[PDB]
Amino acid sequence: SSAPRFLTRPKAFVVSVGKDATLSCQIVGNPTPQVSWEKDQQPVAAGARFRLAQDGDLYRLTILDLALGDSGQYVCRARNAIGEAFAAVGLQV
Amino acid sequence: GIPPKIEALPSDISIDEGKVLTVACAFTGEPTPEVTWSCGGRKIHSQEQGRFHIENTDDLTTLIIMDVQKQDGGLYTLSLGNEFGSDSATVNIHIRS
Numbered sequence: 001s002s003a004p005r006f007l008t009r010p011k012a013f014v015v016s017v018g019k020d021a022t023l024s025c026q027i028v029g030n031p032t033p034q035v036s037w038e039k040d041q042q043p044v045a046a047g048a049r050f051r052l053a054q055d056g057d058l059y060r061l062t063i064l065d066l067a068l069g070d071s072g073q074y075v076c077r078a079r080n081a082i083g084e085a086f087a088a089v090g091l092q093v
Numbered sequence: 094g095i096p097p098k099i100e101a102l103p104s105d106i107s108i109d110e111g112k113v114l115t116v117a118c119a120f121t122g123e124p125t126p127e128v129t130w131s132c133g134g135r136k137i138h139s140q141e142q143g144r145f146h147i148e149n150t151d152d153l154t155t156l157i158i159m160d161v162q163k164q165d166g167g168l169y170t171l172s173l174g175n176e177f178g179s180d181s182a183t184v185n186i187h188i189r190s
């Protein structure tokens with residue numbers, strides 16, 4: 001039915017170092033897209049450092065206890081049966 | 094006046110044959126810079142009847158490659174330019190079976 005597309009490009013929300021940080025975006029598609037994240041071409045492994053979640057068309061990566069080591073180019077990949085959509089965001093803590 | 098800057102463009106991206114590819118990249122610069130997508134020294138032209146499409150706003154560029162074919166694989170260069178300077182960045186698009 002529809003290839004994935006970003007309604008909102010990935011945007012970072014930072015409070016401070018030591019507090020959680022969120023890279024979030026709005027993605028549409030039919031079938032609904034699968035979202036994957038990669039920091040500096042290295043894929044994000046969910047767990048202690050990162051947490052992935054999605055409320056409807058809102059997809060969000062949470063970086064727990066933000067550190068200077070979390071700085072880098074994060075690439076969001078929305079994939080489905082029809083296509084792929086890529087968009088990136090540079091995080092500088 | 095403000096010189097242009099490519100915000101964040103992926104280094105490498107991969108897609109399977111026959112699918113649609115979308116690469117959205119944000120940019121800065123006043124006056125609004127000339128967006129130029131190129132591959133192997135050849136400028137990508139947004140052909141309405143073709144497979145390749147480029148959707149440009151005042152702050153965002155989007156590369157569209159419909160029904161991706163093996164030949165489309167390569168090193169794509171996004172290049173902005175205005176009265177006050179220029180910036181370039183590369184995305185290595187890979188094609189798979």
Ligand SMILES: [Cl-]
Pocket residue numbers: 077105106107
């Ligand atoms: Cl990829």
